[PDB]
């Protein structure tokens, strides 16, 4: 059953995301409730950023961690072609064109994680300071590794608004729900209907 | 501990419980199997909402799940879904309680919802529509017989369906179930892992 | 034609209020409650109105201004999904059962008398007026269409469709987009070519 | 007068025109193809206006200062059913602007960056728009380093308000922010006078 295969894969991603967050310096020093808030507030953009960057090698598609390629045809057939194109044009291709490396990706995800605008944070200023610490490092990295590109640091930060809106649209249009195709849903129900009864 | 899979398994039960209920509805299984699937997908959200709303008549300021779990208004607002929780209580639960909607009337309303001829992709909508017509014909007869002093009770039942429609949409829109049934197992899982090395 | 559109909306708002006032017992309600009901319902009320007006029309919607809007424009404007929901769930259903204007008026009166509206000082009063209305609608259906005992319910069971379609219309900016890109682009181009 | 909808349309007409005149005074903007100028304005007018009254509202407390001089307090917003976004505007934009003392030169640059959005759909030459954006934030960085050298991270802090502006912009359109704030009273007044009439 593809459904349980999907569900445990999500459990796996949640696991890997938390472990990644704990490896981020000073994150675990935050109040436990604040750590949960940041994860819940960011795990959508964080995952989108991840598979977008992973999909630089792929053409007209998205590369999942499970190795599964999702082409734009499936997306448009699933009724989410607009956002899929938004992901490809505003994130994937932009990452490809500027050759965003994994260090830069990690910093951007760290910045996203340290979102001081998240509601219910007991100490936003503490979170803000950690974000400041991160992009200070990112600028240093960009300056030394790409000195012929003085504007690279800003270009990285200016992908974040796109990630913000795309993240919202993805939830709005049930992006992940619909990228299973609802064949797994139909199959799931058909199995239920054909089961023994009374 | 595996929160997402636990959550999917819990949804698995409710869907199945709903499937068994649907097959016990007369003439439903006589429909094309594809159309049966279509109706369930189109209706499962409102069908479940109608169920726990009526089940929550005994409860105050809260919702009673089939799993026996009592959910309070505090938790809902704290989970960020307090607006819908209130509309569920005001537009469905309290209205059901006030008019003393019985189990037979609830079953018919859910049968009407199930037999939705507006569902997309139905091979024979007229067939589904005919089954709906047969259902609310019965419901009217029941209401006039058991509550003759209330001539307008039949319509009052039908006029809860628009509320159920909108509330159903908002519930999906604001991830109602995910935030209600799924918050605690996930938060527990995260907190355990965060306190670990 | 932006000002044409704005003035047309002003006209519709006017006609809707006047229609509401001619509805019995409506004006006897508290004034703040009358406002609440209008705001809560004016979307579904208008949708019901042009849907029924569009029965004569094929694959399209007939506006009060006489403007015909085809299915092509809607899908090109990116709102073809709802447009089809309007046509299939409302317009064609109204056509098939030959819903007359008396039945339409009652349904809109029921919508207007929505006791679920937020902030109502006396919901029970509003609910009572709704009860008065559909009691009358049943009597009308029984006498004019006695060979159709289920017609009354069939009318009421269009209201959930109207409810969802009303919501979808708002979130997808249905009215905004049915003017198209052109009136807005024209509007801005005029601004840009103006002196500086 | 009467006709509340037309009054409301006229007011929006005025604001957009003010925005068009501002855009034309931005260097190299008018040199773009006219169709591209329209696209950028449609794509950006919402965030551009939000950025404007947010910064204008630095002087006021628990409220928003409109160009017409009208003060809108938080409770009217909550009473109008748009209190959630109003708080997001005050917290994520207004107070942040006030705290860091964002000047009008920095505000103008940020709006110029927003205006020069290369992610806008249908642009005939996105690279041309992107180049103009690059020119702008290059200038903004120079300005920040010159005027606020004791604040090395000020440039990034400015850019990192743009994701907030992006999401707040979307929510504002989604919840009919302007309509419920600007249009509630003139419409309610009109209805009220009609209802008390014969
Ligand atoms: C797609 C997806 C979304 C989420 C989650 C997980 C996923 N999943 N599920 N399977 C995935 C697989 C990939 C992948 O292969 O790249 C990315 C995300 C995935 C968690 C469980 C972290 C909750 C947060 C949301 C709902 C955003
Ligand atoms: C709500 C939801 C459920 C699931 C999934 C995803 C979601 N989604 N989808 N968007 C979401 C957004 C959030 C959120 O940001 O809070 C939480 C869950 C979300 C995946 C894709 C992980 C499959 C597993 C199930 C079906 C449980
Ligand atoms: C029924 C149900 C559906 C879903 C979800 C959960 C449910 N579940 N799961 N357990 C439930 C228990 C009840 C109940 O006790 O009433 C209702 C719905 C329930 C999640 C949270 C997984 C999101 C995915 C969908 C929306 C399919
Ligand atoms: C489309 C439309 C919507 C609304 C309004 C008005 C309209 N308009 N505007 N022109 C219309 C024309 C028709 C029509 O021809 O049927 C219906 C509605 C119309 C008012 C002014 C009542 C405010 C309430 C909302 C925004 C729902
Ligand atoms: C927000 C809005 C504005 C306008 C119009 C419609 C709206 N919309 N669109 N959806 C709305 C929904 C509501 C509402 O339900 O409150 C109010 C106004 C709405 C029409 C179509 C009447 C043209 C006139 C202007 C452009 C002022
Ligand atoms: C700018 C603006 C836009 C709109 C509307 C209103 C405005 N207006 N109108 N006057 C405004 C005044 C300000 C302001 O003081 O900053 C901002 C936006 C304003 C309505 C209410 C007509 C909804 C339709 C759209 C969204 C086009
Ligand atoms: Br999109
Ligand atoms: Br950029
Ligand atoms: Br966007
Ligand atoms: Br709600
Ligand atoms: Br009612
Ligand atoms: Br739709
Ligand atoms: Br029906
Ligand atoms: Br301006
Ligand atoms: Br919000
Ligand atoms: Br400015
Ligand atoms: Br920040």
Task: Point out which residues pair with C70 in neighbouring strands.
Answer: C60
Q: Cβ(C73) to ligand 4 under 6 A?
A: no
Contact C153, B140 (CB under 8 A): yes
Contact D65, D93 (CB under 8 A): no
Integer angstrom CA distances of residue D123 from A165, D39, D128, D133? 19, 7, 10, 14
| Residue D65 main-chain phi, psi, to 5 deg | -100, 115
Q: Counting atoms of ligand 5 from 1, which one is nearest the CA of C169?
A: 10
- Residue A44 CA to chain centroid, in angstroms? 5
Q: Can you say which residues of D are annotated as belonging to the binding site for 9-cis-retinoate?
A: 56, 67
Contact B186, B1 (CB under 8 A): no
- Residue A14 CA to chain centroid, in angstroms? 11
Q: Cβ(A10) to ligand 1 under 6 A?
A: yes
Best CA proximity match to A28, nearest among B191, B163, D71, D139:
B191
Nearest CA in chain D to C4: D6
The continuous run of DSSP H or E covering D71 comes out as: strand D71-73
Q: Cβ(D143) to ligand 5 under 6 A?
A: no
Q: What is the DSSP letter of A65?
A: T
Q: Which domains does chain A have, with CATH numbers?
A: 1-198 (1.10.565.10)
Burial class (CB in 10 A: 0-12, 13-18, 19+), B112: buried
Contact C106, C133 (CB under 8 A): yes
Burial class (CB in 10 A: 0-12, 13-18, 19+), C193: exposed
Integer angstrom CA distances of residue C43 from A161, C165, C166? 33, 10, 6
Number of H helices, E strands in chain B: 11, 2
Question: H-type helices in D27-94, by residue range?
Answer: 34-56, 74-79, 83-88
Cβ A160–D162 below 8 Å, yes or no? Answer: yes
Contacts C154 to B, Cβ<8 Å: 133
Contacts A35 to B, Cβ<8 Å: 190, 194
Interchain contact C128–B (C-beta under 8 A): no
Mapping DSSP to helix (H, G, I), strand (E, B) and coil, where does residue C121 land? Answer: coil
HEC string of A115-126?
Answer: CCCCCCCCCHHH
Q: Counting atoms of ligand 5 from 1, which one is nearest the CA of D180?
A: 16
Best CA proximity match to B23, nearest among C182, A143, A197:
A197
| Residue D63 main-chain phi, psi, to 5 deg | -160, 180
Residues 139-168 in C contacting D (C-alpha not used; CB under 8 Å): none
Mapping DSSP to helix (H, G, I), strand (E, B) and coil, where does residue B72 land? Answer: strand
HEC string of D18-44?
Answer: HHHHHHHHCCCCCCCCHHHHHHHHHHH
Contact B123, C106 (CB under 8 A): no
Best CA proximity match to A9, nearest among B179, B8, B197, B174:
B8
Best CA proximity match to B190, nearest among A39, A119, A127, A111:
A39
d(Cα D195, Cα A71) in Å, to the nearest integer?
57
Contact C166, B168 (CB under 8 A): no
Bin D62: left if φ > 0, else alpha if -120 < ψ < 50, else beta. Answer: left
Contact B190, A18 (CB under 8 A): yes
Q: Cβ(D26) to ligand 5 under 6 A?
A: no
Best CA proximity match to A137, nearest among A162, A122, A156, A118:
A156
Number of H helices, E strands in chain C: 11, 2
Query: What is the number of residues in chain D?
Result: 198
CA of C137, closest CA in chain B: separation in Å? Answer: 11
Report the nearest-CA residue for atom 24 of ligand 2: A7
d(Cα A58, Cα A81) in Å, to the nearest integer?
17
Query: Which residue out of D3, D4, D5 has the highest number of ligand 4 atoms within 8 Å of its CB and is therefore the one to mutate?
Result: D5
b/e code A33-46 from CB counts within 10 Å (16+ = b) = ebbbbbbbbbbbbb
Between C182-192 and C2-22, two packed helices, what is the crossing angle to 10 degrees? 130
Task: Point out which residues pair with C69 in neighbouring strands.
Answer: C61
Number of H helices, E strands in chain D: 11, 2
Q: What is the DSSP letter of C59?
A: S
> Can you say whether the dihedral through the CA atoms of A96, A97, A100, A105 is positive or negative?
negative
- Report the greatest alpha carbon distance in chain D: 69
Cβ D20–C191 below 8 Å, yes or no? Answer: yes
Burial class (CB in 10 A: 0-12, 13-18, 19+), B1: exposed
What's the D128 CA to ligand 6 centre distance in angstroms?
A: 30
Contact D41, D23 (CB under 8 A): yes
- Residue C79 CA to chain centroid, in angstroms? 17
Contact D183, D4 (CB under 8 A): yes
Report the nearest-CA residue for atom 1 of ligand 2: B178
Query: What does R_g of chain D's alpha carbons equal in angstroms?
Result: 19
Q: Which of B112, B152, B165 has its CB closest to that of C131? A: B152
Q: Which of B91, B133, B154 has its CB closest to that of C116? A: B91
> Can you say whether the dihedral through the CA atoms of A50, A53, A57, A63 is positive or negative?
positive
| Residue C184 main-chain phi, psi, to 5 deg | -75, -45
Ligand number, closest to the Cα atom of D8:
6
Contacts B90 to C, Cβ<8 Å: 116
- Report the greatest alpha carbon distance in chain A: 74
d(Cα A30, Cα A122) in Å, to the nearest integer?
10
d(Cα C117, Cα D114) in Å, to the nearest integer?
39
Contact C192, D38 (CB under 8 A): yes
A140 annotated as belonging to a binding site for a ligand: no
* Method of elucidation: X-ray
d(Cα C88, Cα A1) in Å, to the nearest integer?
35
Residues 33-62 in C contacting D (C-alpha not used; CB under 8 Å): 34-35, 38
Q: What is the DSSP letter of C109?
A: H
Integer angstrom CA distances of residue A152 from A104, B129, D158, D159? 10, 61, 16, 13
d(Cα A8, Cα A39) in Å, to the nearest integer?
19
Task: Point out which residues pair with D64 in neighbouring strands.
Answer: D72
């Amino acid at each position: 059953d593809p459904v349980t295969n999907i569900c445990q894969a999500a459990d796996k991603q949640l696991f890997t995301l938390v472990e990644w967050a704990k490896r981020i310096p000073h994150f675990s020093e935050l109040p436990l409730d604040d750590q949960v808030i940041l994860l819940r507030a960011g795990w959508n953009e964080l995952l989108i950023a991840s598979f977008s960057h992973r999909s630089i090698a792929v053409k007209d598609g998205i590369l999942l961690a499970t190795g599964l390629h999702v082409h734009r045809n499936s997306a448009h057939s699933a009724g989410v072609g607009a956002i899929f194109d938004r992901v490809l044009t505003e994130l994937v291709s932009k990452m490809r064109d500027m050759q965003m490396d994994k260090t830069e990706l990690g910093c951007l995800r760290a910045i996203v994680l340290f979102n001081p605008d998240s509601k219910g944070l007991s100490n936003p200023a503490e979170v803000e300071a950690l974000r400041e610490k991160v992009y200070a490092s990112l600028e240093a990295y960009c300056k030394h590794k790409y000195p012929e590109q003085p504007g690279r640091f800003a270009k990285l930060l200016l992908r974040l608004p796109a990630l913000r809106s795309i993240g919202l649209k993805c939830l709005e249009h049930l992006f992940f729900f619909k990228l299973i195709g609802d064949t797994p849903i139909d199959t799931f129900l058909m199995e239920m209907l054909e089961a023994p009864h009374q």
